[PDB]
Amino acid sequence: PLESQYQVGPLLGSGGFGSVYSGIRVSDNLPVAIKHVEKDRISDWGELPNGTRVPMEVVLLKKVSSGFSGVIRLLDWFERPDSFVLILERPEPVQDLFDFITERGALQEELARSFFWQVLEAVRHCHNCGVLHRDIKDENILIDLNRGELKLIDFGSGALLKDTVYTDFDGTRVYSPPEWIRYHRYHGRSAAVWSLGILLYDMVCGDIPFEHDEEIIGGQVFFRQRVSSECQHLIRWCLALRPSDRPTFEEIQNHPWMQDVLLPQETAEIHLH
């Protein structure tokens, strides 16, 4: 029972991730997002403890969807003959962070601090659950505009977290670290931290720092906007060319720029309402 269980609304969008629709659960009018992806387009597969063959995204989402977190939770999923369908939480009202930055331009540091901190907490949650997202970027972050909470989306390029080297990467190129560009090798946490430096820069400057491969591996960070020296210092540490020179998640959250973060609700009151 799929169409009996969900009222399908308009298409929100489509791309490499599949096709995503607005929907509501009929049993209680809960807003949902309904994501369709063709089996032909799924390269990465896993299986459920009970021996069922599902896309890796379902395995990863099940792992992170227990309890409250800054991750959009998987509520349900269906197999069809030629596709899988995912039922996901939908905040309302909602705007993705790419859109928000496009509309508002570069964020005030107070807002970027709150947003960055919530992304850090969500990524820590994922890593605690054994999951690597591998496509952290503004487009994969939803803002709940009334509650001021950020939520991570799109685990379709993720992997189980391991301590050994990754040699595959189907995430967003310009959020990809210099060691991937140069060697097709990265480790999970240090690459994630690179993607976080790219994201923080994006928030405070209003655009990503590097366009082409040559800039990524040169790793020279130029600021287009006025940015505090403490925030510049954190960004530059995250974007260290050597992965071992990058900060741990703890070191980021203990950085001076990260102190005195606003709560979600006060973030929404001051900056979103």
UniProtKB/Swiss-Prot annotation:
It holds the Pfam family Pkinase. It comes from the Eukaryota. One of its GO terms (biological process) is protein phosphorylation. It catalyses: L-seryl-[protein] + ATP = O-phospho-L-seryl-[protein] + ADP + H(+); L-threonyl-[protein] + ATP = O-phospho-L-threonyl-[protein] + ADP + H(+). Autophosphorylated on both serine/threonine and tyrosine residues. Phosphorylated. Interaction with PPP2CA promotes dephosphorylation. Ubiquitinated, leading to proteasomal degradation. Expressed primarily in cells of the hematopoietic and germline lineages. Isoform 1 and isoform 2 are both expressed in prostate cancer cell lines. The active site is at residue 135. The modification Phosphoserine is found at residues 66, 229. Induction: By interferon-gamma (IFNG). Strongly induced in leukocytes by the JAK/STAT pathway in response to cytokines. Induced by different cellular stresses, heat shock and cytotoxic agents. Interacts with RP9. Interacts with HSP90AA1, this interaction stabilizes PIM1 protein levels. Interacts (ubiquitinated form) with HSP70 and promotes its proteasomal degradation. This is Serine/threonine-protein kinase pim-1. It comes from Homo sapiens.
